[PDB]
Structure formats: structure tokens, C-alpha cells
């Protein structure tokens, strides 16, 4: 509506556009997410219905704030607090330098606090990737883009098979488990943790089978001992090559022993044994954690 001046287009989706915008009356800078109802003869997209209803219940320093919803006939606007940029842009800007170890630890600690809050509130994020994570100038990072999020039951049922961006997608999803849960979010953060440390995507698959093999080649091909039930999974094949697990000194060279220990628990194959966000926060890796300021 008329009280926002559009500054620039900071994002795009098939759903609509995201603009940096300024409230003309108060001066407040916001991110403005436009969603097209008009090309919807189905009404309000379920993606928007979930994003809004779930964001309204999630109030936390490490989760982006939904300020307002403007629902007209032809359009739907979500108004969010504006943050300096997404973690992907930051990572690209840091590709040459590297992100200081104390900052990587701060960001992982914060992401884990936002995620533990989501899970305690029975929300799965399901799209944790660097471009959906937002940083400000004071050293904070927040979960964003809840468009794929879902409220889950205890215990879970079968939910949507197609979830999580390929590079960040957990093995139990690739192997077609009918049931998945909070562990898929922990897996994505594990991948993001490694990506911060090494300045490179950990498992940059160009297809589902390629994604799977990249994981196997690094963590070893899972068998019934490390992952009971795995050979019984719908997309598992006994003809998969058997690779041996690499040493983490090879995988994340810069990481100390505590860092390697945490990462490996976040990348555990068996979703049931994979570390929870709550437990991750209590890991020795975080005992010295500080909140340094990023360089932008």
C-alpha cells in the first residue's frame, strides 16, 4: 500500500518478489515479501498460510520477525524486520579471507538456539540453507524463510517428500524414508557449519544419486551396523558402491577436536542417533563462545 517506498528488489521467487522498503511515515526500514494471489485461482497459497501462521508463534532473537501482514484481494504482503544480508552473500564476500573461528562458532550457536526453539514449538523448518539465514551488523544471525516449514505431531506422520534444497538434504530423505523429523534440520546445519569452516559447499550434488554418493564418499557408505534399517529403505540399492569413511582432518582441516566431534554428531547417519539442537548447545565446542561483530 501507499505508506511504503520500494528501495530495491533484494530477492525473487516464483511466489513473488522481496523488496527492501521504507515506511514513509515512521522511517522504519523493512523487507517486503509480495505474494501473488491473482495468478492463484486456488486462493491463498498453502505455503503462505503456513509461513504466516507459524512465524506468528515463533518469537525469538534468532528467528526473523514478522512485523505485519497486509491481505488484499489481489495480493498478500508479508512485512519483516530488515537485516543487512543473507549468509550466502556474506560467505561469498568472505571467500578469500575466511570467516574468523570465533564468528563461525557464534553463528552456529545462534542458529542452534533458533532451531531448538522451532523444535520445542513443534515446527520443522525444512529449508535451512545459507540464503535463508540472515545476519545484521551487530553479529546476530536469524532463521528466515519459513515458506517450507510445517507443524509436526508427536510422533510424526509421513510428510511431503520433496523438501530441502538438494545440497542440504538429509540422507533419510534421499533414501525415501516415509517418516522424517527434526533431524533433517540438524543435518542441514551440519552442512552449513562445514561450509563456513571450509568456504565450500560440503556436498554439492547435481542430482539425487550424485548427492547420495557425495555423502557416502565422505562419511562412508552406511550399513546395517551404523544405520539399522538402512538397507530396507525404499530407494536404497544393495549395488551402491561401498566407500570408507574419510578422516575429518581431511574433510574440515581448520576444525579443532571439539568442532570435529560436534560436526560428526550433526552428520550422524541414523536420524535417531543424530544430535538434537538442545544437546548441540551443550557441546564443549561452545564453552568459550562469544558474540563478535562481522566485517561487512
Amino acid at each position: 500500500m501507499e505508506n511504503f517506498q520500494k528501495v530495491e528488489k533484494i530477492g525473487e521467487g516464483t511466489y513473488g518478489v522481496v523488496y527492501k522498503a521504507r515506511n514513509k511515515l515512521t522511517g522504519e526500514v523493512v523487507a517486503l515479501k509480495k505474494i501473488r494471489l491473482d495468478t492463484e485461482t486456488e486462493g491463498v497459497p498453502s505455503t503462505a498460510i503456513r509461513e504466516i501462521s507459524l512465524l506468528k508463534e515463533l518469537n525469538h532473537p534468532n528467528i526473523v520477525k514478522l512485523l505485519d501482514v497486509i491481505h488484499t484481494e489481489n495480493k498478500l504482503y508479508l512485512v519483516f524486520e530488515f537485516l543487512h544480508q543473507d549468509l550466502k552473500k556474506f560467505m561469498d564476500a568472505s571467500a578469500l579471507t575466511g570467516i574468523p573461528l570465533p564468528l563461525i562458532k557464534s553463528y552456529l550457536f545462534q542458529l542452534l538456539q533458533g532451531l531448538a526453539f522451532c523444535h520445542s514449538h513443534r515446527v520443522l523448518h525444512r529449508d535451512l540453507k545459507p540464503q535463508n539465514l540472515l545476519i545484521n551488523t551487530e553479529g546476530a544471525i536469524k532463521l528466515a524463510d519459513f515458506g517450507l516449514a510445517r507443524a509436526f505431531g508427536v510422533p510424526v506422520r509421513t510428510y511431503t517428500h520433496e523438501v530441502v534444497t538438494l545440497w542440504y538434504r538429509a540422507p533419510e530423505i534421499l533414501l525415501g524414508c516415509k517418516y522424517y523429523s527434526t533431524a533433517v534440520d540438524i543435518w542441514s546445519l551440519g552442512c552449513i557449519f562445514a561450509e563456513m569452516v571450509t568456504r565450500r559447499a560440503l556436498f554439492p550434488g547435481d542430482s539425487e544419486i550424485d548427492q547420495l554418493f557425495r555423502i557416502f564418499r565422505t562419511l562412508g557408505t552406511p550399513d546395517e551396523v551404523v544405520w539399522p534399517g538402512v538397507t530396507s529403505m525404499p530407494d536404497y540399492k544393495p549395488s551402491f558402491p561401498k566407500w570408507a569413511r574419510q578422516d575429518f582432518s581431511k574433510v574440515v582441516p581448520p576444525l579443532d577436536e571439539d568442532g570435529r566431534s560436534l560436526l560428526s554428531q550433526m552428520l550422524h547417519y541414523d536420524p535417531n542417533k543424530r544430535i538434537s539442537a538442545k544437546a548441540a548447545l551443550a557441546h564443549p565446542f561452545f564453552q568459550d563462545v562469544t558474540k563478535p561483530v562481522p566485517h561487512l
Binding site: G43, P45, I49, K56, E57, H121, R122, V154, P155, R157
Partner: protein, 256 residues
């Protein structure tokens, strides 16, 4: 037992109090009654079966309907439009594959148009302020089921049936929170099938003693006894099926 599980239960116990409809709202409705509401909910049970929707979707639609009718006066000729947009909205929230709007229009036999259903969806969203994630009797049941080792599937189908019957009659059941209805339905289902009683582990987790379930339990027991007589039959027909272990065909206990 994941370590966020106790947190989720506590959270849902707080949300069910915030998402509760006004208990006496039907008195304030000039043109519609508890009986028209029962006909609507029963019809929504059949719509759920026709589209193979989850039970959760049905429980959410009823929550949305009761909250909407708590702040909005509705004539009897528009009650089904409210119920249809409620079901469409619960479908988009809950279902992997929500039926398209044209199908919802078809299931009312063109009683309403597409434009009307979409406009009613907008109004319902506005009135509920998009707070769609309500705790339901269903969510509390599934948590209570985890206290059966090993799982008893017949007890589970029976508890679900009793919980779904409660959706039909606003008087008495709007008087009880979903968690307490789920407690009585679980104990009643368990007593019927195994002759056993509400487990001490659930009494500690929920805070409900068997004693505190009693008022709701007396009501639920009566509803169970009189189910074959009730004017709305769609839930009994649904739970005759073998996937539900034909639990609606089980004889209720005579006394508790």
C-alpha cells in the same frame, strides 16, 4: 523420547487455552443452533472420507469453525460456506495434497460459487488472524498413545473414534479442553479394550488424575452408549471399516 517432546506437550497445553472458542457462543447466535452445527460437522466427516483427508484436518476445521462462530453471526444458509472454507483452509495447512477449490465447490453441489468460497477463505483468515495451528484432541491422543508399550492399535482406533464423536456435540464438549477430552477418550478406549485404566505415567505428565477426567468421562461414556441412536451417523460408518479395526462395532462397557 526426543528431548523436545516434553516442551511440545507443555507448549500445546498453553496454546489450547489461547485457541479455545467461547463456550456459550451458540446462545448468542440468532439463526443457527447446536443441531445445525452437528449436521455440518457430520457432513465434514464424510467430505474427509471422500477426499481421504487426515483426521487432524477434520479436527482443525472444527476448531476454525467454532472460533469463527464465536465472533461472527451467520445465517443458516451461509453456515455450510463457513464450514467449506474452514475445511479448505485446514487442508492447505495440514495436507500434503489439499483438494483444489473447484472440488470443494463440487462437494457442496454448487450450493456456492468459487468466488464465494475464496472470499469466505479470506474472511476466515482475517477473523482468525491467520492463527491456524491449533492444538486438537487428535494431537494430544497421539502423544498419549506413546505410553502404551507395546502399542495397542485397537485401543488407538477406539480412542480416535471417541474423540471424533466429541466433535459433533458442542453441548457438552465445548466445555472441555482438547487435552482433557483426549484423556477421557484414551482411558475409556483402554478400559473398553484391555479393561485397564489411565496410566500413572500419563497422570504425572498431564496433571490429570483419573478423578479429574470423571466429569468428561461420564459424558463421553453416555455419548458412546447412545451412538447408534444419534441422528448423525457418519463417524460410526467410518469406524466400522477394518483399517479402524471396526471399533465402532465394539459394545461399550455398561459401567465404569
Amino acid at each position: 523420547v526426543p528431548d523436545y517432546q516434553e516442551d511440545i506437550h507443555t507448549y500445546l497445553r498453553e496454546m489450547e487455552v489461547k485457541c479455545k472458542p467461547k463456550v456459550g457462543y451458540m446462545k448468542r447466535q440468532p439463526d443457527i443452533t447446536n443441531s445445525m452445527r452437528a449436521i455440518l460437522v457430520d457432513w465434514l466427516v464424510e467430505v474427509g472420507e471422500e477426499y481421504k483427508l487426515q483426521n487432524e484436518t477434520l479436527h482443525l476445521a472444527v476448531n476454525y469453525i467454532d472460533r469463527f462462530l464465536s465472533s461472527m453471526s451467520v445465517l443458516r444458509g451461509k453456515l455450510q460456506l463457513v464450514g467449506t472454507a474452514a475445511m479448505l483452509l485446514a487442508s492447505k495447512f495440514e495436507e500434503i495434497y489439499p483438494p483444489e477449490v473447484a472440488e470443494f465447490v463440487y462437494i457442496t453441489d454448487d450450493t456456492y460459487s468459487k468466488k464465494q468460497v475464496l472470499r469466505m477463505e479470506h474472511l476466515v483468515l482475517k477473523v482468525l488472524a491467520f492463527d491456524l495451528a491449533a492444538p486438537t484432541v487428535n494431537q494430544f491422543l497421539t502423544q498419549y498413545f506413546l505410553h502404551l508399550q507395546p502399542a495397542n492399535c485397537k485401543v488407538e482406533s477406539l480412542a480416535m473414534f471417541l474423540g471424533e464423536l466429541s466433535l459433533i456435540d458442542a453441548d457438552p464438549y465445548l466445555k472441555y479442553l482438547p487435552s482433557l477430552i483426549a484423556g477421557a477418550a484414551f482411558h475409556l478406549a483402554l478400559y473398553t479394550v484391555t479393561g485397564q485404566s489411565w496410566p500413572e505415567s500419563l497422570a504425572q505428565q498431564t496433571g490429570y488424575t483419573l478423578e479429574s477426567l470423571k466429569p468428561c468421562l461420564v459424558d463421553l461414556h453416555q455419548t458412546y452408549l447412545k451412538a447408534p441412536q444419534h441422528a448423525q451417523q457418519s463417524i460410526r460408518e467410518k469406524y466400522k471399516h477394518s483399517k479402524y479395526h471396526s471399533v465402532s462395532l465394539l459394545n461399550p462397557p455398561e459401567t465404569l
